[PDB]
């Protein structure tokens, strides 16, 4: 389940979750701790070069959404705020802390982001479906929150399904219409060699380059198009998500050069 | 220092998601309000153009 005994809380401070910046950081929450109500993803990051956990397509999407843009430094997925910070400021707003059992909970925000420039070089993001936003107590859960990070001087920001770009949301629902498939060392080889392709036929669309692939070295029809697809759901390959994948030329595709650490 | 209940939200601050909840349009979604005020805010708005 996503609630914690006292024990578990003090187990997860003592490894240290919530501490660290881009590979370091080892996030407070894990897809372990995903609601029965919803799907979990691990995605790897060329940002942060993580494997992050997600806990719902909404914050998958709104982590797609913050790794493709270029200023973004860091991305700090289900961020926990300080106990007795919380603590203090559920007392003063008159607002019950949440707890379960008789356990005050570890309060967190979804992503804490850093950027190297822009308008923003922090903001905190609490994701929520829509439909939540008329709960009253999601609201007192929000406040709570909301005052944390005023408290810290921090901008943070509420985002929901309909803040999802509609192309954005298209590509998400082609590239994870069904259960992601699980990225073999094999899969993950391919890596370099597409990396190559694409890289030469940067002016050209990717799927006409995947077909033309399966053409050019006799494989089964559709069989590129498929790795790039199980590459890209894991994260290894980002591209242009504001465009249809369709639609994006092989230029448009990012594609990280990788290392199985299951030998070295 | 006592648990404010949902009746006495219109009590509270301005800024608070309570109060904002409690003064509320009803025939439109806390979704819209929220986003009216800039709580709610989409990717392109935090990010240069
Ligand atoms: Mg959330």
Same mark, same amino acid.
Do not use: Q
């Given at each position: 389940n996503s609630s914690f005994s006292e024990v578990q809380i003090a187990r997860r401070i003592k490894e240290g979750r919530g501490q660290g910046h881009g590979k370091d950081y080892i996030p407070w929450l894990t897809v372990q701790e995903v609601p029965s109500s919803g799907r979990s993803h691990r995605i790897y990051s060329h940002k942060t070069g993580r494997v992050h956990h997600l806990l719902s397509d909404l914050e998958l999407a709104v982590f797609l959404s913050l790794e493709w843009e !270029? !200023?973004?430094?860091d991305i700090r997925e289900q961020f926990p705020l300080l106990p007795s910070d919380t603590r203090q400021i559920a007392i003063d707003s008159g607002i019950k802390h949440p707890v379960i059992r008789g356990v005050d909970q570890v309060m967190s925000t979804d992503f804490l982001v850093d950027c190297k420039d822009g308008p923003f070089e922090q903001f905190a993001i609490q994701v929520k479906p829509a439909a939540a936003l008329q709960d009253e107590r999601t609201l007192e859960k929000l406040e709570l929150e909301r005052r944390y990070w005023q408290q810290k001087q921090i901008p943070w920001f509420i985002f929901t399904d309909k803040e999802i770009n509609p192309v954005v949301k298209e590509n998400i629902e082609w590239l994870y219409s069904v259960k992601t498939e699980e990225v073999s060392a094999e899969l993950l080889a391919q890596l370099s060699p597409l990396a190559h392709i694409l890289q030469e036929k940067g002016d050209e669309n990717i799927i006409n380059v995947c077909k033309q692939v399966d053409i050019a070295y006799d494989l089964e029809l559709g069989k590129t198009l498929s790795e790039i697809r199980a590459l890209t759901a894991n994260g290894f390959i980002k591209f242009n998500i504001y465009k249809s994948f369709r639609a994006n030329k092989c230029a448009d595709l990012c594609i990280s050069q990788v290392v199985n650490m299951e030998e070295l | 220092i006592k648990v404010v209940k949902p009746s006495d939200w219109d009590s509270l601050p301005d800024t608070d998601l309570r109060y904002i909840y409690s003064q509320r349009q009803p025939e439109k979604t806390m979704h819209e309000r929220l986003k009216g005020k800039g709580v709610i805010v989409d990717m392109a708005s935090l990010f240069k153009q």
């Open positions: !270029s !200023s973004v430094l | -």
